[PDB]
Amino acid sequence: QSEKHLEKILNVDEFVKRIFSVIHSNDPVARAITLRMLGSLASIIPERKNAHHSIRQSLDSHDNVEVEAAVFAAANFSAQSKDFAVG
Amino acid sequence: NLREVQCLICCLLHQMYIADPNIAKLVHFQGYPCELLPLTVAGIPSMHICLDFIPELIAQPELEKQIFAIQLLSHLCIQYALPKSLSVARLAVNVMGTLLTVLTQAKRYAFFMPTLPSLVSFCRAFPPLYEDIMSLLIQIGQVCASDVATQTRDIDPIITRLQGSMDPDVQLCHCIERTVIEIINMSVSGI
Amino acid sequence: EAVRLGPSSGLLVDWLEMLDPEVVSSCPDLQLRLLFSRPSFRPYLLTLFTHQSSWPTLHQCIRVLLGKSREQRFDPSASLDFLWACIHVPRIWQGRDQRTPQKRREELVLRVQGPELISLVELILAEAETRSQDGDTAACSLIQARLPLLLSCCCGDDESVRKVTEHLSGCIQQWGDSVLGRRCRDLLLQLYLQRPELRVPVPEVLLHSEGAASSSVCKLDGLIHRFINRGADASMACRKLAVAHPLLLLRHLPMIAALLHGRTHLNFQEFRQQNHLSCFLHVLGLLELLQPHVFRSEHQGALWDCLLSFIRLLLNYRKSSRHLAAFINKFVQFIHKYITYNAPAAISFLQKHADPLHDLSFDNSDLVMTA
Amino acid sequence: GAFVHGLEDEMYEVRIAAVEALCMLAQSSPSFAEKCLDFLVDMFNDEIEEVRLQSIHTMRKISNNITLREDQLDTVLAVLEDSSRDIREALHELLCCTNVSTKEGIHLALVELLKNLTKYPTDRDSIWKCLKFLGSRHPTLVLPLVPELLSTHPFFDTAEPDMDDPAYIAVLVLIFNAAKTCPTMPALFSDHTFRHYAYLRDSLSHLVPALRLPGRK
Numbered sequence: 071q072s073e074k075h076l077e078k079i080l081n082v083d084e085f086v087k088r089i090f091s092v093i094h095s096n097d098p099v100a101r102a103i104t105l106r107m108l109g110s111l112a113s114i115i116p117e118r119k120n121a122h123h124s125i126r127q128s129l130d131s132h133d134n135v136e137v138e139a140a141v142f143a144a145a146n147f148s149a150q151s152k153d154f155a156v157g
Numbered sequence: 158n159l160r161e162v163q164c165l166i167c168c169l170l171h172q173m174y175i176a177d178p179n180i181a182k183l184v185h186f187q188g189y190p191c192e193l194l195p196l197t198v199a200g201i202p203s204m205h206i207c208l209d210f211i212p213e214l215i216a217q218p219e220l221e222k223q224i225f226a227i228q229l230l231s232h233l234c235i236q237y238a239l240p241k242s243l244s245v246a247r248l249a250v251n252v253m254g255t256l257l258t259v260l261t262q263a264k265r266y267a268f269f270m271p272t273l274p275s276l277v278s279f280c281r282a283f284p285p286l287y288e289d290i291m292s293l294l295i296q297i298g299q300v301c302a303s304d305v306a307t308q309t310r311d312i313d314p315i316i317t318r319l320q321g322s323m324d325p326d327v328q329l330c331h332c333i334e335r336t337v338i339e340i341i342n343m344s345v346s347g348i
Numbered sequence: 349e350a351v352r353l354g355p356s357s358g359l360l361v362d363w364l365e366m367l368d369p370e371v372v373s374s375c376p377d378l379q380l381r382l383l384f385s386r387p388s389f390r391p392y393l394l395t396l397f398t399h400q401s402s403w404p405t406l407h408q409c410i411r412v413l414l415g416k417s418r419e420q421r422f423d424p425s426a427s428l429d430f431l432w433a434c435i436h437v438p439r440i441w442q443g444r445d446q447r448t449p450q451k452r453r454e455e456l457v458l459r460v461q462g463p464e465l466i467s468l469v470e471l472i473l474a475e476a477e478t479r480s481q482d483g484d485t486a487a488c489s490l491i492q493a494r495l496p497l498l499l500s501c502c503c504g505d506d507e508s509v510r511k512v513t514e515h516l517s518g519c520i521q522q523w524g525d526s527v528l529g530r531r532c533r534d535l536l537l538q539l540y541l542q543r544p545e546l547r548v549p550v551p552e553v554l555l556h557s558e559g560a561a562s563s564s565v566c567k568l569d570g571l572i573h574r575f576i577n578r579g580a581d582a583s584m585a586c587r588k589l590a591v592a593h594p595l596l597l598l599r600h601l602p603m604i605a606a607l608l609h610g611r612t613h614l615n616f617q618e619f620r621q622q623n624h625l626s627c628f629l630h631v632l633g634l635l636e637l638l639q640p641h642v643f644r645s646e647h648q649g650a651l652w653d654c655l656l657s658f659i660r661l662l663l664n665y666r667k668s669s670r671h672l673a674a675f676i677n678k679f680v681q682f683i684h685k686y687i688t689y690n691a692p693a694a695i696s697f698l699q700k701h702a703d704p705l706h707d708l709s710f711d712n713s714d715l716v717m718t719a
Numbered sequence: 720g721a722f723v724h725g726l727e728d729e730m731y732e733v734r735i736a737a738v739e740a741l742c743m744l745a746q747s748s749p750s751f752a753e754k755c756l757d758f759l760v761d762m763f764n765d766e767i768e769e770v771r772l773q774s775i776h777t778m779r780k781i782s783n784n785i786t787l788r789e790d791q792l793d794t795v796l797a798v799l800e801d802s803s804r805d806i807r808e809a810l811h812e813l814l815c816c817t818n819v820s821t822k823e824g825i826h827l828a829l830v831e832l833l834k835n836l837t838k839y840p841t842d843r844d845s846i847w848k849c850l851k852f853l854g855s856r857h858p859t860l861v862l863p864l865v866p867e868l869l870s871t872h873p874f875f876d877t878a879e880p881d882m883d884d885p886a887y888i889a890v891l892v893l894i895f896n897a898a899k900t901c902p903t904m905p906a907l908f909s910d911h912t913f914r915h916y917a918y919l920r921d922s923l924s925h926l927v928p929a930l931r932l933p934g935r936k
Contacts, residue, residue: 096202097175120883123918131446132438133168157921158403160440168443199455202445235453238876281452283874346505347452348535348561447910448876493936555906563907567863599903603862609821612788 076114086115093124101128102139109143116150126157167200174203182210186217188225191271198232205237211245215252220264224271227253231275234282243286246279250289257297262304266325269297273336280340281347294337301329349382361389371397372405384413384422394426398433406434414460414467424475431468432497434458457503462510468501469511469527476523491526492554495533508534512541525550532556532596542593551647552599562589562600570607573627583630590634594641597634598648604631605651608658616667625671628662631655632677639681643688653695656682660703669709679715726762731769734762738777745781752785760790763797768806771797775809779816786820795831807835811845815852825860829868829890836886843885847926850889854896861897865907879911882918891919895927905932 079085089111092104105128108121115121125147129140147154174181185207189197198204207229214226230249234242253272260268280290304326305315314327353360371393372379383394401409413427435458449455460468472494476487502508512531516524525548531541535557565586572579590597608627614620635642635655642652659678669675686693704716725737741755759778765771787794798810814832819825832846854861868890870877880887895916898904908916913934919927920935929935 096205097172099172119922122922123882126918126921127447127914132441132444134438134442153922157918161442164440164442164444171443200444235450238450238874240875243875285874346535346537348558447914449910451910489931489936492931492933496933553902555902555904557906559903559906563862563866563903567866570863602859602901603903606820606822606860606862 073110073113076111079114082114086111086118090120090124093128098131098133098136102133102135105136105139105143109139109146112143112146112150116147117153122147122151122154122157125154163196164200167196170197171201171203174201174206178203178206178209181207185210185225185229186214186222188222191225191228194228194232198229198236204233208233208237208239208241208245212248215249220268223252223256224268227272227275231278231282235278238282243283246283246286247289249275249279250286250293254293254296257293257300263325266329269329270332273332274339277336277339277343281343290340294333294340298330298333298337301326301333305330349378357389361392364393365396370402370405371400372409380409380412381421384426386420386423390426394430395433398430398437410434410460411464414464414471416463416467420474422471424471428472428475428494428497431501432494435497435500454503457500459503460501462507465501465507465511466514469498469514472498473523473527476526477521479521487523488526488553491530495530499534502534508536509538512536515544530554532558539592542595545595549645552595556596556599558589558593558596559600562596563603565589566600566604566607569604569627569630573607573610573623573630576622576626586630587633587637590638594638597638598641598644601648601651601655604634605654605658607631608655608662611658611662611665615665617670618667624662625674628659629674629677632659632674632681636677636681636684639684639688642685643692649692649695652685652692653699656685656696657699660699664703664706669711672711675711679711683715722758726758731767731773734765734770735773738774742777742780749784752781755781756785756787757790760793763793768803771803771806772809775806775813779809779813782813782816782818784818786818787824788821791819791821791824792827795828798831798835807839807842808845811842811849815849815856818856819860822860822863825864826867829864829893833886833889836889840885843889846889847892847923850893851896851926854893855899858897858900861893862901862904865894865904871907871909877909877911882915888919888923891915892923892926895919895930898930899928905930 089104089107092100095101105125108115108125125140125143128136129144131137131140144154181203211226211230211233215223215230217223217226227249230242230245234246256268257265276290276294279286302315307326310324310327312323312327314330351357371383383390383397397409410431413422413430444455472491475494476491479487482490498511502511508531511527512534515528516522525545528541528545528548529550529552531545532552533554533556536542565582568578568582569586572582586597608631610620611624611628614624617624635652641648663669663675663678666675682696686696700716704712722737722741726734738759741758745752745755756778759774762774763771765774794813798807800806814828819828832850836843836846865871870880891912894904913932916927916930916932917935920929
């Protein structure tokens with residue numbers, strides 16, 4: 071909902087690290103939620119490499135909710151990043 | 158169609174295990190048939206935390222719980238090869254040796270018949286346990302051999318150094334020699 | 349199938365799936381020749397049939413597809429990709445932990461019969477023998493791509509035996525040397541498969557299952573050389589693996605060609621008790637054992653030439669030939685290599701144009717010209 | 720006895736003139752070059768940045784079919800300096816065009832350059848270029864290093880290393896630039912190493928080359 075307030079965040083790195091600390095969990099629904107959060111956060115983190123690696127890794131996974139969230143976040147990163155777009 | 162039901166049930170069990178590990182501990186204390194032990198370990202990632210209570214499960218006075226703990230640990234060591242898994246594997250070898258010291262013959266058969274493939278799994282997972290594993294085998298072999306000499310037998314396996322409802326002792330000796338065959342052919346083709 | 353209507357056939361394709369509930373319901377023959385033939389809408393109906401039909405119907409199709417039939421009524425590309433899709437349907441692996449496997453462990457395969465294996469391998473080689481414009485390297489890439497399916501459907505030693513025991517006749521467009529080369533991927537234990545592959549004498553570029561073990565053996569040999577228990581194994585296992593299989597050690601020859609460069613540290617070799625004495629004796633033992641591979645064809649003599657140049661440089665740096673057994677053995681190996689091949693003799697003459705003049709020894713002059 | 724006295728007398732004028740002379744007469748003479756090789760490795764402690772820079776140049780011009788048996792230790796510890804930015808980039812240009820025929824030389828060069836990385840996190844692009852060219856120049860010498868350089872423990876599972884650590888990336892770009900020609904190297908990786916190859920190929924296409932791995936066809 072609050073997408074237009076995302077560019078006002080100052081301490082971006084701590085925010086993204088705290089969000090990103092859930093990709094390495096083993097609950098697939100939690101992982102899918104965190105990739106959806108990355109896709110929402112796409113505007114403020116266009117060129118973060120570990121995010122792209124997580125999207126690529128979870129994109130060819132076998133849990134369907136993880137796959138769908140990965141496609142969402144790949145669509146949202148692909149609108150802004152270029153190396154992500156070609157890979 | 159069986160595999161689809163199996164993987165769906167594995168998904169639900171993984172969700173229920175990550176919801177609360179106490180259910181996983183209670184279920185593995187209760188036990189399930191060993192033919193599910195591959196499927197439950199290969200398919201549910203959460204069984205990694207199952208390596209937390211194998212020392213506790215192997216310490217229970219009940220015996221079939223100890224066979225279940227040994228078999229579950231073996232399949233976990235096949236799946237996850239970690240220093241934690243190797244340490245609990247060494248503990249398992251020590252527990253099997255101690256129970257070899259303390260077991261009645263009928264209970265010795267009932268304990269050592271379903272375990273011995275787990276020793277193949279332990280040896281396949283970790284090279285540094287080989288000789289330790291080997292030591293246990295040679296010990297169990299000769300103690301079973303001594304039991305064969307205690308009473309008359311219908312097959313006389315002692316003089317069969319060349320290659321149904323039988324005596325339990327010759328069945329245990331045959332299980333020991335077959336698990337040695339499996340270990341050797343695993344080692345030869347293991348590159 | 350018959351009318352070649354351009355756009356409207358797509359609607360017909362829709363109407364097919366719009367009114368036929370499965371993919372195969374009532375008329376199997378026309379539908380099977382529709383999906384597999386000697387079109388443009390084929391991939392959509394085929395990925396349907398991958399994800400549409402019931403499992404008994406899929407097994408019926410998998411037995412009738414790879415069945416015994418000399419008519420070749422099925423396209424190999426569509427059929428093999430249908431196989432590879434049926435191996436990895438996402439409904440089969442719907443919740444298993446992904447991309448943390450054990451390479452030693454094999455999780456699951458698909459079981460087929462012996463004649464099924466024979467039919468599948470002749471179908472994949474019939475695919476490999478097309479070669480309209482692809483070339484040999486594209487053939488190798490294709491059979492590399494289709495090889496893990498063969499390893500999946502076999503999954504054993506005796507089916508490995510029954511596939512390696514079948515070698516066809518003919519001399520042109522054979523392409524049976526490909527499977528006789530990827531028996532290394534199959535990791536066979538018999539020298540009979542190595543004998544036909546050595547008779548073929550083709551270059552090896554694919555990875556082998558036993559390559560890591562031989563790499564560890566070469567590293568153990570280097571560690572035994574640099575040490576002066578594990579040295580005994582490093583001395584035994586390398587020679588045993590070389591005599592067991594020559595193609596593997598021929599492939600690993602560049603890896604061991606970079607070794608044995610510690611001769612310049614102790615030119616007199618008095619300080620080096622075994623750092624510059626045991627390693628050269630071991631590698632000359634390997635070469636005198638694999639003399640049949642030393643006289644091999646082209647694209648392999650560069651490593652042997654480098655080894656010979658290193659041996660000549662070590663001989664020139666010796667303490668006026670204090671040890672004559674190793675020098676005599678090296679001269680015997682060089683004489684055998686020169687007698688075996690003319691190209692190796694020319695390379696040895698090119699080296700000895702500078703090496704034998706610097707040597708000027710009795711054995712060098714001798715090698716320069718029972719019961 | 721000219722060059723045995725022609726160097727160690729005066730300021731950069733005499734030294735640079737003499738070493739440009741040995742540049743041209745190592746270019747003209749295919750022989751002799753081991754002698755100019757070991758008459759350049761001594762003159763590293765001349766306390767002149769210009770002499771160091773033009774010395775890196777005078778041996779990078781003559782680096783053709785020349786190997787370094789014992790004189791490679793000083794030329795890799797010469798990087799150890801406070802800033803030396805032009806000297807450092809010249810040294811990375813030297814290291815990517817040199818030729819060497821030993822294994823322990825590769826081991827010491829890699830550990831010293833990783834120590835350079837851990838002391839100066841500033842020039843990761845330059846070292847990625849020189850390690851790429853070092854892998855491309857000679858692939859064969861680093862085959863036994865891969866079982867030793869990275870964690871490849873036989874039975875313990877190899878943990879996935881830090882992707883964003885820009886030091887594992889350098890040894891990967893070495894490995895996969897040296898993996899283009901030799902066939903006995905895909906069998907020696909692990910699953911995480913193929914996924915790292917996938918991301919390095921898709922991200923840094925100008926560093927790692929395309930391989931024939933089954934994972935990325």
